[model samples]
Target chain A: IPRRITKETQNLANEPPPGIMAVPVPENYRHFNILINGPDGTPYEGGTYKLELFLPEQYPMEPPKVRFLTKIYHPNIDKLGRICLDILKDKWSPALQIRTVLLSIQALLSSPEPDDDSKVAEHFKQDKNDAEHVARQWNKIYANNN
Target chain B: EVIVPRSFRLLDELERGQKGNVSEGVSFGLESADDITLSNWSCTIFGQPGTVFENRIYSLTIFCDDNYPDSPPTVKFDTKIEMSCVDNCGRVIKNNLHILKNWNRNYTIETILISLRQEMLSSANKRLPQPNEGEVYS
Candidate 1:
């Protein structure tokens, strides 16, 4: 069946948006593995995070399911790499492009927020210094597979 | 006006909802099934505290086609509950304006959910007994 993946893939290759790199799995246009450089100046700076994305049949109609594959120390990200972002959930719209979603994730790294289910927010709330230190350390050790 | 596909229009509305005001006790998103189409969606409704369906979680499947907006999306219940407007197969009837029939292009998924929840309070459906509160049909 004809799909948008081919067109999107072409667009992604010819003009990849800032801060992200993505490639679909061999022969399966539906699945993509990606990397995002942590925005400069954040605790996540100098770090690279991996993500797994799957585009459903509805694609532009539905948001791609995305989850962090690399460890990240942030209030909005869970131990399982699940993110607490609106766009990925109830706020998703077809008008959004994959590039836009990746940019939003990169943006999230810069301004993390408390998640309903994680203690990261509590930790950050109680001690910003400790949180930053841990985040930076995680970034150093796990972000680059060091 | 540009006539984007209903799917695109729905997507646009959902995106806008993220930045706009939303009512409480209503949550929905695209179905996360391993291989599902955009035409199929999964949604959850938490009945308001004071309502008969209160504290009950209702799971629903919604189907939208290229004809959506001009045509209404079809909605079915995964959580079986006996109601006037719903069929035995858990699909909402076309006669139900909130889900179908008297559809307006401007009506949104959010409005549909709200209206469906309100059905539990209608004179006909309010008194109906729920068989399986949270159980999913096979």
Candidate 2:
């Protein structure tokens, strides 16, 4: 509905991030199918994470909703696949775009934080040791091993 | 053999364009089917993949007067883009775009657009900086 939709979509395809691919769904401009390769050297490394990102009608005024389709093990993300990040909530700003939101998700993978944590957060807080092992375990089974 | 008339040569291109004999990623036609002089036309080029121009569509206007096939047409961009061949106002420079510089008789608008596409995809021009996407001639 907004002219920003086309402009942002074109920019996403034109100069995309190194490991992120966010293509708009054919039927809907606001809906996008996303692919963010796991950040190397982290638990998500060598894995391809599937995600769906959607722009609300008030986009630019509201941050995009990003949900991981491929389940990943991270303290900030719950088993239901929603992420806990400041940018998505009250921290959202009009200048932030689709690429910027997706880039933030990739960085979140690099370093998982504990704020309003989830079940994985419980794992992180209780025993930070095997949590990484379980994270890699899910990486091999749910995502890619190599 | 006698010299072929520019009208017939131009119309020959018209026929090719009408008959759907065009390369992929490009399209062109008379500005109006009734603009019988064959002097005004329009075209659009889809940016080639793997280049900085990828996923962007460019609109250009080409006008070939009676001297075409001898004198190249005036090629201008309706959508703004900057490169070695295109000027700041979006007029494609003839000397820089060799297709017009050499002035080959066999060249057609199809060749011109295809050449322009290739030029945009060139290693040098592909990375040429562009104004914000969708900016057009004011």
Candidate 3:
């Protein structure tokens, strides 16, 4: 009986936040399939990204591990779609909820950060406009069709 | 209709965990959470005798994603016991990827749990003191 997992599952099943749809994998409440809409007005706007979310046995106590399954072009997101976000890493707090985490990722997309494991961040640092254009193009080509 | 064959990777591993007694001190299973038939699993390992961890029960969470057998499962600890390769959040880092890079499909969670248990007995780990024993981390 995983109390936190059960509670989190019931909560998400009952009333999930807008712009985000998360489904726990059947038979496995710890793993989730997440789809979130890109924040409007950002290069990621008009795109939809799929993400994998997992609650390690230490749910609430440890922040959920999340990674983008959809390919995207963003300074803070790598080729493997691993995100570099404070909330998802060291700055994580147990008080935060899945809804909050999703919102944070959305917010990150809106305000692209320049720290990542790819040349994308280097390009963004060199020319913001060029980086934004490339990101939008990638989003349209890769994220929209799917 | 091309129906993808469901792999028995997790089932085989689960059965091994249930049947094979790794040792009296270590026990594992899918006690709670979800994905009973899939790759998600939970486990507990009691610290080895005479070591600083003796009698301590440490909980672990394991995930063998859809890419299991070919790829090593992601493992984390719910009851923290200091060890290399594991991060502050309990995720086992892929720092030593060569071993897992050549992961054989025949490998099971039982193999991983045993390795972790053995890690506790290593000279460096045996003497390491743990402040909390039998306590679940949050």
**lDDT of each residue in A42-119, candidate 3, tens digit only:** 888878888878776566776877778787878887654567888877888888888788888888888877854457
Cα shift from native, residue A16, model 2 (Å): 0.7
Q: After superposition, how far is residue B66 of candidate 3 from its true place, in Å?
A: 5.8
Name model 3 segments beyond 4 Å from true: A115-117, B1-67, B70-138
DockQ order of candidates, best first? 3, 1, 2
Candidate 1 C-alpha lDDT tens digits along A6-102: 8777887788877788998774666777899988888888888998777766678878778787888899886657678889888899888787888
Q: Write the per-residue lDDT of candidate 2 for residues B68-87, one digit (tens) a residue.
A: 87888999999988788988
- Which fraction of the native contacts appears in each prediction? 0.00, 0.00, 0.00
| lDDT by residue for model 1 (B1-138), tens | 323444345555554444545567676666742222346677777765555677788989887777777878888989977788888888888896454678887877777778888887787777666775777666
Angstrom error at residue A58, model 1: 2.1
List the global CA lDDT of all models. 0.75, 0.81, 0.72
List residue ranges in candidate 2 displaced over 4 A: B1-138
Q: After superposition, how far is residue A7 of candidate 3 from its true place, in Å?
A: 2.6
Runs in model 1 lying further than 4 Å from the true structure: A1-3, A115-117, B1-138
Worst 10 residues of 1 chain A by lDDT: A110-119
Q: Give the best candidate by TM-score.
A: 3
Model 1 clashing residue pairs (backbone) = A58-B38
CAPRI tier of model 2 = incorrect
| Alpha carbon lDDT at B69, candidate 1 | 74
Q: To one decimal, what is the Cα RMSD in angstroms of model 1 from the true structure?
A: 10.0
